[PDB]
Amino acid sequence: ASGRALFQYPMTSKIELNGEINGKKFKVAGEGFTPSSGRFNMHAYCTTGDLPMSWVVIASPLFHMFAHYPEDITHFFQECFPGSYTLDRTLRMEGDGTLTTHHEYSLEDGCVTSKTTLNASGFDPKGATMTKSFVKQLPNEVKITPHGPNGIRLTSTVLYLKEDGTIQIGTQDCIVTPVGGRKVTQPKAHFLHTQIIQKKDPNDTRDHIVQTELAVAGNLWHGMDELYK
Numbered sequence: 001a002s003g004r005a006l007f008q009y010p011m012t013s014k015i016e017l018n019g020e021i022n023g024k025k026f027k028v029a030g031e032g033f034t035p036s037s038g039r040f041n042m043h044a045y046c047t048t049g050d051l052p053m054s055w056v057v058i059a060s061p062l063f064h065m066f067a068h069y070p071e072d073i074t075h076f077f078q079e080c081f082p083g084s085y086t087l088d089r090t091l092r093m094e095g096d097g098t099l100t101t102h103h104e105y106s107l108e109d110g111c112v113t114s115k116t117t118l119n120a121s122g123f124d125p126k127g128a129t130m131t132k133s134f135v136k137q138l139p140n141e142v143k144i145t146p147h148g149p150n151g152i153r154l155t156s157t158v159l160y161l162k163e164d165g166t167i168q169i170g171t172q173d174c175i176v177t178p179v180g181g182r183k184v185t186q187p188k189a190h191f192l193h194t195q196i197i198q199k200k201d202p203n204d205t206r207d208h209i210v211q212t213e214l215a216v217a218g219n220l221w222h223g224m225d226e227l228y229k
């Protein structure tokens with residue numbers, strides 16, 4: 001049993017996230033549900049106190065193996081199992097700060113555990129990330145291409161909505177590296193439509209978020225694959 005056969009739904013998730021932003025150290029944990037392909041939720045919470053940054057910005061740090069792929073595009077993230085992969089992200093909040101994250105994953109008993117680190121340095125202390133002035137981030141299309149002999153790269157531009165209805169941009173890039181000692185067949189260049197929605201639990205006492213991601217792959221631009229050898 002490998003690849004897509006390891007992702008029979010429903011499944012669950014856990015996260016352990018150790019973070020630091022502008023020298024403010026924090027920890028997040030969470031548990032989540034993946035009812036079906038491409039729809040995955042996570043109820044996270046700060047275990048150190050209040051989260052010292054926007055929950056909207058931390059949303060993408062908070063599981064691409066749960067994205068929904070058609071049969072005719074390789075689901076690289078699922079095909080990495082068994083063995084797993086690492087994810088390394090850079091998120092540049094333009095004019096604000098840059099953060100990085102590193103993710104390791106393990107699958108056991110239908111549950112993917114993410115162990116993530118986040119490091120953010122140089123953020124504007126009056127910016128929207130630190131002041132928690134974002135309402136949501138808009139849905140976007142993430143470009144996925146082969147990268148190196150055995151990886152893939154994900155890129156996106158994110159529009160972050162401030163309370164005043166205006167936008168701030170983030171630029172996001174990730175590299176995905178199989179860690180399983182084996183070559184995983186790269187997909188053709190394609191895109192992932194991603195929507196992140198956040199709400200609060202009616203009763204939880206912690207600083208927390210209840211987040212849902214919808215992530216659906218498609219060959220949006222058939223010609224794109226020719227450009228990536």
Ligand SMILES: [Cl-]
Binds near residue numbers: 053054
């Ligand atoms: Cl927030």
